[PDB]
Paper text:
Below, the description of the Nsp7/8 structure is based on the 1.5 Å structure Nsp7/8C, unless otherwise mentioned. The conformation of Nsp8 has previously been described to resemble a golf club (Fig. 1 A; (9)). The helices involved are the two N-terminal helices (α1 and α2) from Nsp8 and four helices from Nsp7. Importantly, a symmetrically related interchain disulfide bond is also found between Cys8 of Nsp7 and its symmetry mate.
SARS-CoV-2 RdRp, also referred to as nonstructural protein 12 (Nsp12), is the catalytic center of the macromolecular complex frequently referred to as the replication transcription complex (RTC). The RTC is essential for virus replication because it makes copies of genomic and subgenomic RNAs and polymerizes antisense RNA. In SARS-CoV-2, besides RdRp (Nsp12), the RTC involves nonstructural proteins Nsp7, Nsp8, and others. Nsp12 is the largest component of the complex, and Nsp7 and Nsp8 are considered cofactors.
Numbering used by the authors:
A (entry chain B): 78 to 192
B (entry chain A): -1 to 70
C (entry chain D): 78 to 194
D (entry chain C): -1 to 73
């Protein structure tokens, strides 16, 4: 309807403006969201604040996680837990190229903001 | 730098309007957080603060599953 | 408190964005408004539609009016009425360089759009 | 000029928000006219139409006497 056409135009313009801003942190969270790596809470800005993010696949995991460090929104996050689609814990050693087919994706990462 | 500041402030008003049209206002405490972030961006001293607050505000939209389609 | 500061910041950003757009019709209405030449109602967009504008002084009048034509917002307008600050009707013949000091500025011009946008 | 379209549309959203804060009444015909102009700008496909509608929408703000200080806002 008319409301939907206006909304579509406004949302399209929003993303065009964001792209033109060309800020590293905004680009990072938008590109991640395009791949299905999305936050589950408001991304916080202070040390040790909590962040939960969906990690949809092994490629996203490897591009965002190194050891216990998650890199996202131009910041570092200390991974606390990784849980599967069945809410069951996943040990980091299980998240490998060869073993990932056996995990219940998507995973949810819970982390705390570093420095 | 200054024109980047005006553009990010304009974008924050658009982002709040997009959230408003997605009916976020009915969720009063989330909406209050969104308004406060928008206000922080409009009052931001420098682009670093504006863009950090915009990461938080945009994350509200990105967290709304299926509410929009980012790929388009 | 903060509500008035947020409003000031949003309004300042609005005019900075408008300046960056650098459109002649927008620049004309903004620059006229800065001089006190302001619309009294929303500017219409169709042929023969009505408009009222404050003309603050003879310098503005000379910059915007020639005969029965008012030029404003990148459009031409046919003048229907000029009233002075005493709410008296000014016939267009009296708004001359020689008679301008006898008029009660500011004037309010009522006009109809000459052509469609 | 297609490169400017996103900026005019962004500005129209700001302008409507500025008018809302100035208490332009929701039930008013003027508010309904402002909303229609904003919607038409957002839906515009060329800058010529967007700018003509922006002229009308901006005139609402310029017409509110003493509600804003235009010289201050343009310093």
């Amino acid at each position: 309807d008319k409301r939907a056409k206006v909304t579509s135009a406004m949302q399209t313009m929003l993303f065009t403006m964001l792209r033109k801003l060309d800020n590293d942190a905004l680009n990072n969270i938008i590109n991640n969201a395009r791949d299905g790596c999305v936050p589950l809470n408001i991304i916080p800005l202070t040390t040790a604040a909590k962040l939960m993010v969906v990690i949809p696949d092994y490629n996203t995991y490897k591009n965002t996680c190194d050891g216990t460090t998650f890199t996202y929104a131009s910041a570092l996050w200390e991974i606390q837990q990784v849980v599967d689609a069945d809410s069951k814990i996943v040990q980091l050693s299980e998240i490998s190229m060869d073993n990932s087919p056996n995990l219940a994706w998507p995973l949810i990462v819970t982390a705390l903001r570093a420095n | 730098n200054a024109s980047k500041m005006s553009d990010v402030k304009c974008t924050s008003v658009v982002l709040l309007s997009v959230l408003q049209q997605l009916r976020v206002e009915s969720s009063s405490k989330l909406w209050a957080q969104c308004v406060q972030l928008h206000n922080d961006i409009l009052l931001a001293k420098d682009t670093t603060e504006a863009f950090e607050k915009m990461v938080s505000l945009l994350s509200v939209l990105l967290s709304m599953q299926g509410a929009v389609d980012i790929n388009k």
